[PDB]
Design goal:
Chains A, B: GO terms for molecular function: pectate lyase activity. 2 copies of one chain form a homodimer. The first copy, chain A, is built from 8 helices and 29 strands. Chain A is α/β, with parallel strands linked by helices. Chain A has a 10-stranded parallel sheet, with helices on one face. A 10-stranded mixed sheet of chain A has the order 3-7-10-13-16-19-22-25-28-29. A 5-stranded mixed sheet of chain A has the order 4-5-8-11-14, with no helix packed on it. In chain A, helix 3 (201-210) runs antiparallel to helix 5 (231-239) and helix 5 runs antiparallel to helix 6.
Chain lengths: 444, 444
C-alpha cells in the first residue's frame, strides 16, 4: 500500500513546507504562470507550499516581463534547438528556504528552465515532469560543455526529497548535488531519453539541421560520406541521455565528503552515465533500474570504422555505457537492483587508475545484470562477477564515517522490480492519483 | 581582530565536527584519560567533537589496560630516553572519520604518542601542545631512521586544519602529509626546539648517557678525544629540531601531485629543515617565520676538524640549515615571511641536481632575510638575491593544476610579523583565551 511511498534514506526527517491548507493563502501559493512562480519563490518570501497548477513554459523569452526578475534569470543562450531559440531558457534559483514543498496534483510539466536550489533546507519536490532542456551541441563538438543546462542542481543544501518526478533529455545533468549538499533522497522517479517518435524533441532538432546542413558542421560531417550516419541513426544515437546524477562536481574537495544521497525505486531508461557518479561522500541506491536497452541498440549503428572517423575530426558522438561510479574515496552501495545492457556497470576510478587518490569504494549486492542477452544475479564480490569494480585496484568497501547506514528501509526483490516500477502506478510524475494533500505528507 | 583567526587556504570548506554543544554527550566527548580518548577515537564511533580536558600521558606502558586497543597501538620501542623507556610510546590512528574536531580549552599537552590520521575528511585539531616524542639516535648513527615517531601524519585524507598548536622535538617529523592528502592548512602554530635548560627534555637524555657513556657508542665517540664535544655542546647541538614537514614521502609517486598544503602565521624556531619539503604537489606559505638563530649559534661549536672527525666514523651530527624545499615538479610559494639564520632558505633539488625530474618549482615574494647579521628584503628572483633557489637549474615558477591559488587570503607585512606571532596572543597553544566554543568555529 501507500507506505511503499514513505520518505526514506538520507532525507529522513525532512517535512518540507509541512501540511498546510490551500486556504492558507499567505504561505500556500497556487502557481498558474511564471509570474506567480517568481513571486512565490522570491528569496525570503516565507512561502511554505507551492502548488503548480498547470504546465509551465518558463523560457526567458516567453514568460511575462513581470517574471523577468530574481528568482528568474536568463540562462546561457539556446544556440541550436528551433523551439528553444524562440522560447529562451531560464534559471530559477531557490535561495535560503527552510521547509518548502513544491508539487503538482497531476504531473504538470516544467519546460525551458533549470532549477537551482541553494543554501536551503528541508525542500520537497514532487509529482512534476521536467522537459525541453536539451539541444544539439555544435559549439563544443559533442562535449556538451557550453550551455550548462541541468534540470535540478542542489548546492550547500540540507534535506532534499525529490519524489515521483519525471525527467527527459537535458543538455547536461538531470539532478546534480554539489557543494556539500547532504540529506538527499530521490525516489519513485523516472529518468528517460527521447523515444525517437516522428515528432519527438530530438527528431525536431535533427529535422531542423537536416534541412540546413551547412549551418551545423558536426552534424554535416556525421551525415557526410566520411562517416555515413543516416538522419535516423543520429536521432537514435542522440535519444539516450548522456549524464544522470553528478554528486560532487569538483575534484578532491573535502566538502564532497559531506555529500549524502539515497536513490530508490527509480527507473533510469537509456541514461548513459552517472547513476550516480560520486566523489568523496556516501551514496546508496536500492531497488533502481538502469535499463540501457535502446542505447545499446543505437551503438550497433556505429561501427569501429565509423567511430574512428568521428573521433579523427575531434568530435565526440557515441554511446557511453556506465552504471554506478564511485571516485575519490567515496562510498557507493547498489543493492537489489536491475541493470540491463550497461557495459561497465560498476566503476571505481575515472581519472587515473594507478593513482589511488582517484579511486572510490563501491559494492553491489543481490542485483540482476544482463548484457547482450547474458544473465547474472549476484554481487560485485564473487569471482568472475560481471559487477566487479573496474578499472583500479579495489579499495575495500566501507561507508565514510559510519559503520552502517543511519536509516532503515524496505527492500523489494529485484526480480519483480521492472513490473512494479513501470506499472500505471509506477515511478514518475502523473502516475499516482490520490487526493493532493498526500503530496505534502512524508509517510502513509 | 578575531577574523585574523579565520580558517584560510587549502583546508577551506572544512567545518570539522561543527558547532556542537558540550551537553550533546553522544557526539561531544570530554577526554580526561587515555581510555576516554580510545573510546572517542575508535573507528566509526561517530564522535564529532573531542575536548581534551587536561594533559595526557599516552605512552603504551603508562596508559590503562583498557586503552591498549585500537585506535591505540604500541609504537616502535624507545631505545634511549630514560623517561620513554618507562612510559613507552603509542601510535593513535584516527581512521575513517568525516567531520571531527579535537581541541582543548587551555592548551593541554599530548605526550608519548604519535597521531596518524588515515582515510579521514574534514578534521580540525586546535589548541594542543605536543611534546616528549624525541630520543637520541644510536641505532641509525644520527640519521633518525629507526623509530619513525612523528607527532601528526596525515595519509589519504582530505581537509585538515591544524591551528593554534605547539610542537616540540620529535624523533622524526612534526606534521607530515602523505599518500595524496589534500586540503591541509596549518596556521597560528609554534614549532620549536629544546631550550637547553638544566632539566630540559634533551638535557635529561644527555645526562643519562653522560653517566653511562660506554652504553652509547656514538655519544661516547662525540665526547671522546677524537672529537672533543662537551656535554653542553651536545645538548646545544641536539636542541634544534631536525625535520619539519614532509609533504610527499615517496619519490615520484603520482599521488604526490595531489598534495596541497597552506602554512601561515606559524613560527618555526630552530627547525633545521623541511619548512616544508614538498614533492609533486602545491604548497603555499605566507606570513611564516623561520628563525634558526640558536641552531646557527650551536653550529659554531663544531669546527671544521671536529666535523671531519664525526663524519669519518660514519656519524651524522650537526646543524642542517635549510628552509623551504620544492622537489620533483612540485610548486612552493613563500611570501611575506621572515627568515633568520637559515643558510639555504630556498632549495629546488635534493636528490640529484643534474636531473631535472628531481627539481621542483619555488618562489619567494617580499620576504625579510638575515644571515649572520645581514639584511635583505625582497624576492627569489632578483639579481644577487640571497633567496635565489639552489642548487639545480631553475624551473620557472607556476602552480600545478591551476594558474592562481583557489582561495583568497590577506597578507600581513613581514616587518611586524615577529612581534605579532611571538606576542602573548601570538602563535601556539595556550595563547588564546576565549570562550571554548570558539575553538569549534572556522570564522569570526
Amino acid at each position: 500500500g501507500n507506505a511503499d511511498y514513505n520518505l526514506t534514506g538520507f532525507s529522513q526527517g525532512n517535512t518540507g513546507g509541512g501540511v498546510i491548507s490551500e486556504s492558507n493563502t499567505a504561505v500556500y501559493k497556487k502557481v498558474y504562470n511564471a509570474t506567480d512562480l517568481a513571486l512565490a519563490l522570491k528569496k525570503n518570501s516565507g512561502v511554505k507550499v507551492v502548488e503548480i497548477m498547470n504546465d509551465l513554459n518558463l523560457g526567458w523569452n516567453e514568460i511575462p516581463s513581470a517574471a523577468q526578475t530574481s528568482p528568474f534569470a536568463k540562462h546561457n543562450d539556446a544556440l541550436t534547438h528551433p523551439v528553444l531559440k524562440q522560447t529562451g531558457v531560464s534559471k530559477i534559483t531557490v535561495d535560503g528556504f527552510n521547509g518548502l514543498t513544491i508539487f503538482s496534483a497531476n504531473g504538470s510539466k516544467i519546460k525551458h528552465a533549470a532549477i537551482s536550489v541553494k543554501r536551503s533546507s528541508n525542500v520537497i519536490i514532487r509529482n512534476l515532469e521536467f522537459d525541453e532542456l536539451w539541444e544539439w551541441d555544435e559549439s563544443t563538438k559533442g562535449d556538451y560543455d557550453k550551455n550548462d543546462w541541468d534540470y535540478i542542481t542542489l548546492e550547500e543544501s540540507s534535506g532534499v526529497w525529490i519524489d515521483h518526478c519525471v525527467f527527459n533529455k537535458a543538455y547536461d545533468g538531470l539532478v546534480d548535488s554539489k557543494k556539500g549538499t547532504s540529506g538527499v533522497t530521490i525516489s519513485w522517479s523516472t529518468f528517460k531519453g527521447d523515444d525517437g517518435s516522428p515528432n519527438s524533441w530530438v527528431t525536431r532538432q535533427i529535422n531542423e539541421m537536416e534541412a540546413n546542413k551547412a549551418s551545423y558542421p558536426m552534424y554535416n560531417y556525421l551525415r557526410s560520406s566520411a562517416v555515413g550516419l543516416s538522419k535516423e541513426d543520429i536521432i537514435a544515437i542522440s535519444g539516450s541521455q548522456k549524464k544522470g546524477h553528478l554528486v560532487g562536481a569538483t575534484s578532491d574537495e573535502s566538502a564532497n565528503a559531506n555529500l549524502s544521497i539515497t536513490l530508490h525505486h527509480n527507473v533510469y531508461k537509456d541514461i548513459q552515465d552517472r547513476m550516480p557518479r560520486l566523489r568523496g561522500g556516501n551514496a546508496h541506491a536500492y531497488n533502481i533500474i538502469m535499463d540501457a536497452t535502446d542505447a545499446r541498440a543505437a551503438q550497433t549503428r556505429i561501427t569501429s570504422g565509423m567511430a574512428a572517423a568521428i573521433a579523427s575530426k575531434g568530435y565526440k558522438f557515441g554511446i557511453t555505457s556506465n552504471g554506478a561510479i564511485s571516485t575519490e574515496s567515496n562510498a557507493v552501495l547498489v543493492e537489489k537492483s536491475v541493470i540491463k545492457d550497461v557495459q561497465y556497470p560498476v566503476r571505481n576510478n575515472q581519472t587515473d587508475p594507478t593513482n589511488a587518490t582517484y579511486t572510490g569504494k563501491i559494492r553491489v549486492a543481490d542485483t540482476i545484470y544482463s548484457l547482450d542477452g547474458s544473465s547474472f544475479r549476484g554481487s560485485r564480490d564473487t569471482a568472475g562477477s560481471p559487477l566487479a569494480p573496474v578499472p583500479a585496484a579495489i579499495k575495500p568497501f566501507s561507508w565514510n564515517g559510519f559503520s552502517i547506514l543511519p536509516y532503515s528501509y524496505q527492500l523489494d526483490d529485484p526480480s519483480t522490480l521492472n513490473a512494479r516500477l513501470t506499472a500505471s502506478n509506477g515511478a514518475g510524475a502523473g502516475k499516482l492519483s490520490w487526493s493532493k494533500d498526500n503530496w505534502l505528507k512524508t509517510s502513509y
